[PDB]
Amino acid sequence: GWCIFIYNLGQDADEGILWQMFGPFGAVTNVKVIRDKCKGFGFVTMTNYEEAAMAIASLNGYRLGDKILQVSFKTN
């Protein structure tokens, strides 16, 4: 699948929130919030390149709570 990196999750962020945000865009096979409390970021894996691109183009810049998310294809 295609790995998506999401920055600016809040300290209380949970996997639930990622599923709820990305699920509506296409097939999602995995989500993970990175923790030490959340470290501020997490990942989602989507099967279909086009749907991943949609989720990314749609959710980058989204205000979650009162923080501005950064969403993009994961880099190495």
Partner RNA sequence: AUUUU
- Interacting residues with its own copies (CB under 8 A): 15-16, 19-20, 23-31, 47, 51
66 vs 76 by CB, closer to RNA: 66
Nearer Cβ to its own copies, position 10 or 26? 26
Express the helix, strand and coil content of the chain in percent, nearest 5 each. 30, 40, 30
By the rule CB under 7 A, 66 interacts with RNA: no
User: How many whole angstroms separate alpha carbon 2 and alpha carbon 66?
Assistant: 27
Among 39, 47, 49, 50, the residue binding RNA under the rule CB under 7 A is 39
What does the angle CA 51 – CA 25 – CA 12 come to, to the nearest 5 degrees? 120
